[PDB]
Amino acid sequence: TRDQNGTWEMESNENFEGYMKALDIDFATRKIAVRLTQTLVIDQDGDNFKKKTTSTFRNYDVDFTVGVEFDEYTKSLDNRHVKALVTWEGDVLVCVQKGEKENRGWKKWIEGDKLYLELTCGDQVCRQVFKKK
Template sequence: GEFSAAFPCIMAALWYFVLRKMAKLMKPQKVIQQNGDVFTIRTISSLRNYAIEFTVGKEFDEETKGVDNQKLKSLVTWDNGRLVCVQIGEKKNRGWVHWLEGDDLHLIQRQTATKHTKQK
């Protein structure tokens, strides 16, 4: 009947819900290494790992493999004790800001999305 036809969709929706809940529980580990103006930032989780290496003040090519698979031109600078990254690519206004307050590492990610709809 109708239920058995809809069963695969119901199971897929439940599985998606479970995966989202599991992902929220898994806190990624952030490893930041500094050698003068050269930084390596690694994000490690059970779902995926990502690493970037950059020199503060020098533009570099960044490929976000496994994250959103974008090719970017990135520039990281210091601003009031915060590392500020501007990323230029297909999506506008991308980037992030990292800073320490005591033992807490803070991260703000910037990404502006634009949605276009047609009026009928």
């Protein structure tokens, strides 16, 4: 309970924009920091502390089952809650995002050794291609 010697990786975070706003800090810097995850390296020898804070952007996670409508909180983009439904269309993974936005969803399909992802939102359509590593 008193031994902080360790590399610590951040897993959550609460009222942080309010803490930065209370510290007299502006939009941008607040808008960056909300997208970062910190890592604390603490070297403690008795009463002596050495702390290092490393930042590396807020990883984003999504979990779903094909055919099971689930709640997708679309952070790192537009902090909205959307009901997502993933289905198989051949080998193309098609998704509908029921929420505040109309015509919100995406389509993803594998062609050979590459993954193609088409993002649809209203009138704007985003096509994305990924490379295997």
